[PDB]
Design a protein around this ligand. Structure first.
Ligand code: ATP
Ligand code: ATP
Ligand code: 9E0
Ligand code: 9E0
Ligand code: MG
Ligand code: MG
Lengths: 331, 334
């Protein structure tokens, strides 16, 4: 059974859910899935302390609500496993400074970067590599934005294995994609992104029906006269995106939906999409609030998951320290 | 409670008289007056690539030499850095309160990048942050180091102050303690660069375990100047080699430079080298007599390490838990 590692930032969209996460929720029996809430990555951006703690718990209950089963998968908070920072430091010594500056798009020799960017923002690719390599990870699902970081982890693993023997597994990307690419609501040729400054482009899993219905009702459609609800990505991006969102929620095929909307207006299409999406989020949010309000259950999940995570992580760290040449701590 | 002293050295070679006068002698002398914690920083040592067997041996060479010098495990906490996870944990957190420009301007990083251009790694660049983590974990008041670490200590002062200005009275602000002589003992054949444990050219350095015949030979070959007549005077700019010998002799004996200049009026460099070699070797007789007994006593070495990591971890965890609360991390359940 392959080991799969995902990091979960404590700061999710329907594109994330109906794309990666929903499919992974159904593969917890096919892979040894590990979910790490990366609160040590989070502090690379300064934030109120009390919001960070809350958002760590929000992220945990959200992933449980999405269906991550802590009896089947390991889910845990990054800072609860000291080995993450321990390996991160050690791997810094096997990472070229030049590799990390390539990641900043070589903007680190300037004065603007020197005066404002903290060393965490510069060094976090090595900590991400430590996250992956601690668990003998075989598979890391990543979007396009993380391919360079994943490649660095593979390079570090191979460089270390070449010096010391096979201590790490060389991780691979997870190549197959699921769902459709959910497109942003006001620019239907750009993928919906959790990062978008225009929040009207995005549906978050924790928005209420009312706000979600407003955004879907305002989604950009085409000028075809008469209006035709028909799938055509090239010429009808907005209408096709709406159909793709509806099909991904309901499982109805696009030809079926095209038959449903024969002779109907774009407003009736938007209404149906808004209802379907709004229905999916209510189920999710109902489960979310049950988990989130049970502080003791959430505490028991984090304790169990960090104990599971620690057992594997310490084995790797002991082998790294032995290979490096450290004197073992007496026990 | 006493004020707290923390200092560390890398397991990267045999300690030199430079390490002794810059740092180690003060470590020993502070052990009654303060609460002293001393560390063999193996996580810092791997920023420069070493053979695994070499690094393992060097860690115990360093530990046994601390002890031989009079670091007393019944007065001080002695431990190996990697045995205490909190150092790496606080090291990562402090990365986020350290600006990139503060590290890129560091003189050590530039110097070591030149020496090891084939291994310019991120640990080498990040070195000062992990050092700040080492110091601030223990509520440290005083850090005895040589002059070369002054810039790194200033970053430690800034990091503590910057962190405390956000989150409260979490860290003590540490103060350097650099001595007035022997703070920067220079290399014997290249007197414009400091003496360094890790120097490939061993004729630049005097190891603390070198016998009197080795000491005289290295001091006799130390670079001087072309002055005719030779003059024993302190002048770094024009007389770097002779000045380095005067600094060393001042550090061994405690005589001031002007007292040494009067003492050597009309004399020659061969006489100065005679005095330096004898003073140096006299300074090493006691530690050399005990080092092998320390080094071959595996059980004693293990016990010192076990006890030191346990004490150091007790104190370090309390600081790190306070840090993780301030920053906003969910605490790890009991
Ligand atoms: N709109 C979307 N449609 C389909 N898949 C998506 C969408 N947004 C994210 N994903 C997928 O979800 C996973 C999470 O990746 P990631 O967090 O980088 O996505 P994102 O939300 O677009 O991120 P960002 O906003 O930072 O660019 C990836 O597999 C990615 O391809
Ligand atoms: N030439 C020197 N003169 C005085 N103090 C020194 C000298 N070199 C190092 N020190 C001091 O010795 C202590 C330990 O430093 P460290 O372990 O880095 O030794 P080193 O000889 O500089 O080795 P390396 O070349 O591997 O850095 C520090 O407090 C440092 O300031
Ligand atoms: C959360 C981040 C992260 C930290 N450690 C890991 C390990 C694997 C994948 C990722 C990460 S994905 C990345 C992201 O920015 O999405
Ligand atoms: C050994 C290094 C180190 C790591 N942690 C500490 C703490 C105090 C002083 C020093 C150090 S001195 C410094 C050096 O490179 O000289
Ligand atoms: Mg993406
Ligand atoms: Mg040094």
């Amino acid at each position: 059974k392959p080991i799969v590692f995902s990091g979960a930032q404590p700061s999710l969209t329907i594109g994330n859910y109906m794309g990666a996460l929903r499919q992974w929720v159904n593969m917890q029996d096919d892979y040894h899935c590990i979910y790490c809430i990366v609160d040590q990555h989070a502090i690379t951006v300064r934030q109120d302390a009390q919001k960070l703690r809350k958002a760590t718990l929000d992220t945990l209950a959200l992933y449980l609500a999405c269906g991550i089963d802590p009896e089947k998968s390991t889910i845990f908070v990054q800072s609860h496993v000291p080995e993450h920072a321990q390996l991160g430091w050690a791997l810094n010594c096997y990472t070229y400074f030049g590799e990390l500056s390539r990641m900043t798009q070589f903007k680190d020799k300037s004065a603007r970067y020197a005066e404002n960017i903290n060393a965490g923002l510069f060094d976090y690719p090595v900590l991400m590599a430590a996250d992956i390599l601690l668990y003998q990870t075989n598979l890391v699902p990543v979007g396009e934005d993380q391919k360079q970081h994943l490649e660095l982890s593979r390079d570090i693993a191979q460089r270390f294995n070449a010096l010391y023997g096979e201590i790490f597994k060389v991780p691979e990307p997870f190549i197959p994609k699921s769902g459709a690419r959910v497109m942003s609501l006001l620019e239907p040729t750009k993928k919906m992104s959790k990062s978008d400054d225009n929040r009207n482009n995005v549906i978050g899993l924790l928005e209420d029906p009312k706000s979600v219905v407003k955004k879907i009702k305002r989604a950009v459609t085409d000028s075809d006269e008469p209006p035709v609800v028909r799938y055509d990505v090239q010429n009808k991006a907005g209408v096709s995106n709406l159909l793709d969102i509806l099909s991904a929620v309901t499982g109805q095929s696009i030809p079926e939906l095209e038959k449903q909307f024969e002779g109907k207006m774009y407003g009736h299409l938007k209404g149906e999409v808004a209802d379907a999406v709004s229905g999916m989020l209510t189920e999710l949010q109902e489960r979310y609030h049950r988990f989130r309000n049970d502080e003791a259950f959430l505490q028991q999940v984090m304790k169990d998951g960090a104990e599971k995570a620690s057992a594997h992580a310490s084995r790797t760290l002991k082998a790294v320290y032995e290979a490096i040449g450290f004197v073992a701590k007496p026990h």
